[PDB]
Design a binder for this molecule. Structure first.
Ligand SMILES: *C/C=C(C)/C=C/C=C(C)/C=C/C1=C(C)CCCC1(C)C
Ligand SMILES: *C/C=C(C)/C=C/C=C(C)/C=C/C1=C(C)CCCC1(C)C
Ligand SMILES: *C/C=C(C)/C=C/C=C(C)/C=C/C1=C(C)CCCC1(C)C
Ligand SMILES: *C/C=C(C)/C=C/C=C(C)/C=C/C1=C(C)CCCC1(C)C
Ligand SMILES: *C/C=C(C)/C=C/C=C(C)/C=C/C1=C(C)CCCC1(C)C
Ligand SMILES: *C/C=C(C)/C=C/C=C(C)/C=C/C1=C(C)CCCC1(C)C
Lengths: 220, 242, 220, 220, 220, 242
């Protein structure tokens, strides 16, 4: 690529290599954890692998044409956000008892939010109603994960699990807020911001989950 | 492990064969749905072939069968995507091949769980398989134009309702009576999936005889990933006791 | 492949996909079975894998030329029938003690029968003597596994192994009879029948072996 | 390929598929045997894999030109015969005590025999002296494996090991005799004979070794 | 590549092959170490693998154009320095208890230092302020791992872990100093020095970590 | 295992990349030797990476190091075969790269076995490594034409004799004094290999300064496969005790 002229290709290569490394990382570290946490690593590994695959496709499209195919980004979000938000249910199940409806509501909210976001970007619906519905679904998920069943499950957990849950909640609140900001900016230079946001929300989340899994399983 | 790293590298290099099929954005929902479903099916295949570590020896089959389902789906979906790129027409033949090679395994999942959790004669699996084969044969005859749309659709709906009744008040209820609560909940969820999840197919079919590919994609997504996830959940919940 | 015009391509695709699925199934399910029956599954997996390989080659030939490449079919039979017929010896060794001459005589009979069938197909010898020799070898193997050493070994076995042996004997008697029937029909519309017969004799056989292996091993 | 017109391509495909199947077979069956016999299977798997690789290369050369590149055959023999003849030392070590010089003498004799055979075929030396030296090395190996240190090691062994050793000795005496016969015939229609001889001496040998390994390790 | 004309290609080939060998070595040697140290080897293997990937890309660029693609070098540094510097946190966690802020501050310092180095290289900001900021971050990390939290954690550790920590600290102080020296030389014949430095800092570091991990685990 | 069968299939499909380099029969002994050595090195790499199951935790390193030796040799041999096919000239640079990346591991095998079997300071490994590096540098200078053939050859022979003496009556003898008889026999065999097996290189080198590629191929074959087999034999003999 070019040198000191473009920051898009550098970000693409950096994120692709990081995602491949994290995928290998998480598919190899499944040997350390116990039987309970051999899923909280597999799901994160799948998240990073799917993100890496779609990043390779986006890099190919960028080489073919110098534009931003946000449809690929929405495909990647639609197959990663459900798993990332399910990670909460997975760690709560591997750490304590969960009724099961938390996963259902989590998944439904995430699917509705993305579908509406994709429809708003593609122009099927007006931008404002789609943005409002997506924000409402996001706030509903935050409320469920902050003061609803998620908080109740987090109350009965070991201190390491509680700290990891708080870190993941902060990540959801702050790092995930970049994408709606970019959506509002585009409906009223972004590829690099999305790359960095995916880097954070796809590597730090998995590393937090791996840390808590190793710290819990080490007991034995 | 370094040998396991070879497996990881092979899994990573498999998408490279798929150079990419994208062509238009925000114009056609078929190609987007095809890629979404293909990637989700590959991810679920890897998930189910990896999560066999947790389950005990009794439930190491209930994951492999679902992994096979998703893998066969993924294979036939690539084929379908290739055909669609070559020609923008309905790949009915490939869809019915995929259904014929996947519905038997999905309906055999019932027998597998009812045998690994309790004792069952298994005649429910045989009769449901026969009903599903009849429904699939009638659907292909209708799609091929041999029979009219309305009679074939009515016969398929009647066969599907039969299968639902067999799953609700047939031998399935008796088998579910002597089982753990987790297996009962899994059976109820799978019965609800049969009632509603499979019901996406005929309604979408009625859409095509009165677009269809998107509905079929979404229906395959649901009834091949949610089913496997429910089976995995019940298998893990049962095997953890060990 | 043509759609709604010929069932040969549909049968080819169906039995290719089913054979690949059965290969993966049999090479993955070796974990459940004990150390005794880790061979009764590997050989079945090899049978299905070789069938899938030769089926891909036959599909390529059919696409290249629309005829009947029976040479590849006889190669597939020559490399799959010995393993399917040695499955009897394998399950008998895993269930009881067998001298070993049963496998030798089975292999010799199966190889002689196929070679004679191939020679009859190719026209090296007269069709009727080759057909008679093949039928005689088939009946000799049936007698050996019905009233000879195979039956004697089956007498001293667990009920599950005996039931599997009876089911496999019934499959050998009935399903395998399609191929000599096709040979007689062609030496006195077929590829579909052969495909279905391969599906049956290469998947149901392996599934019976897997079922009996799992039933035997799990007990412990 | 052609149908009922050539028997070379059929033999090539048959042997290649059989060698690939046997390679997979032996690399998978290492899980059944104990720690002692996890080498007697690896070496046979390597033999079949190398033979399969060189058979693929020979098939490619045959497609390129319809002739017999015996240099490839001698390369395959030079990297398979040492391992096959070492299999004796490996099973004797895994079954009883071996001094170690048996391997040395075995390997030296096999290397000398092939090198002289290759030189005679390539015309570096006269055919008769090379044939005489190769036959002398072969007879020396047979004597060592029949009445020398090999027989002494076979005397102190379990009956299964003794039977396997006798079977391997008979294979060495009879099946390996095909190659010098073909060499004499060509230095005074052969590719098919060499294919079949490799089939036997590369599959039956490994199957005998696997049989004795499984029968020994089953004890535990 | 030219022979006896330029040492850049020789260095590229040497450090590519060595990095691949070290990657395989570190991903294979995870079997020996216990469950505590199955992470240090994994991270070292990831470091070497990413280095090998970016080295292959840099070799391709060099063949395509005979210049210095320092952008790829800084991508490699940005994706490898955080892991090498978190190896300290990993070994400290595997040997004793660490709060976790050490890894956070290490990562922040390393990322800030490179980003500033990349900006100085690209000319986004003035070279001297970026060099000063990078040196300040480097000295801050050295102080943290020499007299701060890292030293305090190293005080309560086994003698082997303390010796490994001292060796790694010496490597950080000495071998890593090549890169700022090269930057000063170029901002006030190099690729060979950088290659050798990468060889050292990416192989000797991992070998020290592997040695201490094996020494700790085998005890048990 | 099916996942293991993926590794087996990858190993089987690796030779497919190598389409084939054969050109002439009974005319040149270089290409034949190249193919023989490449295939033997790949086989030994697979053998040493598979046989780690038998050896105990102490000797699971003495096999991995030899496997990498053979793997690096195989990689550089392919490169050398490609260069030779492109141009029929001596690949001196690749040979010295391979030597520089393999001789250190082969000489480190001594330290590895003397540490996994008994206690040794390890200065013998360091001094032998320094001597080998000096010998390789002198050989590279002689081959590049910087120095004359006779002085470089004499210096290399003197360094090699030094290394032999260090292996005979240096720290190696003291380390071998306190060891099991199997380790002593392995050390004697490796010392004999150093004395005679490596001696193929200088004499063949003297052949090139007074073909060479065939001698170097055979020498690499011996000193990289027999060495690994001796290490594997001693490792298995020691670890079986468990
Ligand atoms: C790896 C990718 C991740 C974690 C993506 C997350 C994306 C979101 C949270 C997107 C949210 C949106 C809204 C809340 C409303 C407007 C539309 C979206 C899709 C931009
Ligand atoms: C993986 C694919 C699956 C589970 C496909 C399921 C398909 C059906 C349940 C189709 C049903 C139909 C009827 C009930 C009647 C009308 C015709 C069909 C074939 C569309
Ligand atoms: C997977 C393929 C299988 C099980 C093939 C089986 C084939 C036979 C049993 C063929 C039998 C024949 C005779 C009994 C006589 C006439 C010639 C044959 C080869 C058609
Ligand atoms: C898989 C290949 C095998 C077992 C090849 C074996 C080859 C021989 C035993 C060849 C022997 C020869 C002589 C005894 C003398 C004349 C020359 C040879 C090479 C043909
Ligand atoms: C494998 C690569 C490694 C270990 C790279 C290390 C790089 C550095 C320590 C770079 C340091 C720099 C400074 C301390 C200041 C000036 C800018 C840099 C990036 C050259
Ligand atoms: C895998 C490669 C190996 C073990 C290479 C070994 C090479 C040598 C021992 C080379 C030795 C030389 C001398 C002793 C003096 C003359 C020059 C050399 C480099 C040919």
């Amino acid at each position: 690529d070019l040198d000191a002229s473009d920051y898009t290709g550098v970000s693409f290569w950096l994120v692709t290599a990081a995602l491949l490394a994290s995928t290998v990382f998480f598919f190899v570290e499944r040997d350390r954890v116990s039987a309970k946490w051999k899923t909280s690593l597999t799901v994160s590994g799948l998240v990073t692998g799917i993100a890496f695959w779609h990043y390779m496709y986006m890099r190919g499209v960028w080489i073919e044409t110098g534009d931003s195919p946000t449809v690929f980004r929405y495909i990647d979000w639609l197959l990663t956000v459900p798993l990332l938000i399910c990670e909460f249910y997975l760690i709560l199940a591997a750490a304590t008892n969960v009724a099961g409806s938390l996963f259902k509501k989590l998944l439904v909210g995430s699917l509705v939010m993305l579908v509406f976001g994709y429809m708003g970007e593609a122009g099927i619906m007006a931008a404002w109603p789609a943005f409002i519905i997506g924000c409402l679904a996001w706030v509903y998920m935050i409320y469920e994960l902050w003061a609803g069943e998620g908080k109740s499950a987090c109350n009965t957990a070991s201190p390491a699990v509680q700290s990891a849950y708080n870190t993941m909640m902060y990540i959801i609140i702050f790092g995930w807020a970049i994408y709606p900001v970019g959506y509002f900016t585009g409906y009223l230079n972004l590829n690099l911001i999305y790359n960095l946001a995916d880097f954070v929300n796809k590597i730090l989340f998995g590393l937090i989950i791996w840390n808590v899994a190793v710290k819990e399983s080490s007991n034995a």
